């Protein structure tokens, strides 16, 4: 039923940086990736409520979506590119433990976690 508080995007206690690599992230890999027809069920968090899912929170202790990420990158939250990437794969990981191979939101996913690799590939190298 509930949803728990979103994962933090702002906090003015936690140290940040503005770089290549995450403007990168920003302008390239989350651009590409939120416009894609798989982006949907990725660009807010799980909504328990609205689609019923009260087991969701139980067995995903560490949530993550692209709307999330998008603010983060938007607001500065990030120290490094790593800490971003690191959501990504939260985010990816997040759907293949809750689901099972084979579903159409695994397949989307994958598909996604696809453009993602290949853009982390040309990351620029840090100024
Ligand atoms: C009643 O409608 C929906 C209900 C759910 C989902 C969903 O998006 C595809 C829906 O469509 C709006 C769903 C959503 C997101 C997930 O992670 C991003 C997930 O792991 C898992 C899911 C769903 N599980 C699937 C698709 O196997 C269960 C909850």
Request: net charge negative; with cysteine; hydrophobic share 35%.
């Amino acid at each position: 039923a509930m949803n728990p508080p979103p994962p933090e995007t702002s906090n003015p206690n936690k140290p940040k940086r503005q770089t290549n690599q995450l403007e990168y992230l920003l302008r390239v890999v989350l651009k590409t990736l939120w416009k894609h027809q798989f982006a949907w069920p990725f660009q807010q968090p799980v909504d328990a409520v609205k689609l019923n899912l009260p087991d969701y929170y139980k067995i995903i202790k560490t949530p993550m979506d692209m709307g999330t990420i998008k603010k983060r990158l938007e607001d500065n939250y990030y120290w490094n590119a790593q800490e971003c990437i690191q959501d990504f794969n939260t985010m990816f990981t997040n759907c293949y433990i809750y689901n099972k191979p084979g579903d159409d939101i695994v397949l989307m996913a994958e598909a996604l976690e696809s453009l993602f690799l290949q853009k982390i590939n040309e990351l620029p190298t840090e100024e």
